[PDB]
Design a protein around this nucleic acid. Sequence first.
DNA 1: CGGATCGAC
DNA 2: CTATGTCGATCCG
Length: 431
Amino acid sequence: LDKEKINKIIMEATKGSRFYGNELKKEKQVNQRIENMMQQKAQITSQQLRKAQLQVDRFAMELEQSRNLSNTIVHIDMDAFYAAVEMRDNPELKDKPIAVGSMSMLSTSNYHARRFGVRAAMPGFIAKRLCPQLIIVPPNFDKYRAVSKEVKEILADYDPNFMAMSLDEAYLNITKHLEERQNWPEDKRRYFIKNSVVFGTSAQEVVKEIRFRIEQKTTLTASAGIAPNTMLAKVCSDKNKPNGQYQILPNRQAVMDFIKDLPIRKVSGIGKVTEKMLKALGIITCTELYQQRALLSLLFSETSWHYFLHISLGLGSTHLTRDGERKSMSVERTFSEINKAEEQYSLCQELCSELAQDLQKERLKGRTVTIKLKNVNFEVKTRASTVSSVVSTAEEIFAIAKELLKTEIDADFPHPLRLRLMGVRISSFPN
DNA sequence: CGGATCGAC
DNA sequence: CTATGTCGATCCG
Ligand SMILES: Nc1ncnc2c1ncn2[C@H]1C[C@H](O)[C@@H](COP(=O)(O)NP(=O)(O)OP(=O)(O)O)O1
Ligand SMILES: [Mg+2]
Ligand SMILES: [Mg+2]
Ligand SMILES: [Mg+2]
């Protein structure tokens, strides 16, 4: 299927559903938010824009002066991870279009099935209309966890303080390693195939070794990115995916050459909404982002344009922080419609128990309890409450969540809440 | 602090 | 029949 035929079959299958109704409503809110930004832009004066331009350029020189090119950052990202695992252990599936998930939702798909536009976050029933030859295999999460542990073992040789972002992806600072490796004999860079082979002393070679070892240990491919910071490393890893790598060399000119025509969307942190908004201001590439830096310092908050300027100058993190403590724990579940109040309370109680059990594992306690409610028209509400002393037992959490749910049931009386999902989250942990 | 939104995988 | 489950950031009131 082709880029126009895809959107035709989706639109055909999605039209008139309650989900679509709610999506239209979400698109209007984004359009309005854009139109408001345009009304803001109309009433900026050339005088303000000049006083901004100076302010921004003073900061841009503060950033530029601190630019660091002396660290080598690698980002590893596995290819079609879940699907690739499922292909590995069932040969029948190879050379065929597959997705891991259910008819309600797909975690991922293999590259074969991606050619038909079936992707992560797509419901299976839509994916079947795009490609009736699609095989949908259920997830085996504990397997993926096991494979992930195999790759993290390899990664730990190259950076003991590597930063796992997910089961399938990670960041490494291979600076201390590259330095040691310059003066290494061939013995310490030699690996046998499962007839031996050696890898060179360069960064491109280190990452060829890593990828090789991953493929030998797991029978799966990864892609990778090499660059002087995390932001850039992450974008390169996507460039030659699947089963390739890319380096931006540590000199200012190569950074800027890469950035020049880079669509802002490929940056991690810029999603669909920020894309559309910035598109409306004639911003699509990272150079265009640099050009509008003054305008952006007026239309967006300090934190936002600070971020945008970092991107426009190809800057990013050059050291990896240890993974900080979690700030919240939550559980939520989608189901066939529940409208009877008594069943809704019981569901909330059950969610409160599950969450209490999960908190017990990490010995966590919190002061804020939030419930989450999605009705059959996909409209989501959250209702929270914060308490003086920390809580953690199923009873305590339910004591709070129960009242938040009562309030919502009462508010619609005599109409019943017709919900398709319910969640409970706990937050406000101690320090 | 409460509620919504964004983005990530 | 049929649109996830999570968590941190950020913005606003
Ligand atoms: N929206 C979602 N919901 C649930 N699970 C998801 C998901 N998106 C991804 N996953 C799960 C399934 C994914 O396999 C896994 C890693 O996410 P990626 O690295 O972003 N995607 P992949 O490695 O499949 O392909 P490639 O990178 O080659 O394009 O996380
Ligand atoms: Mg991947
Ligand atoms: Mg990833
Ligand atoms: Mg992005």
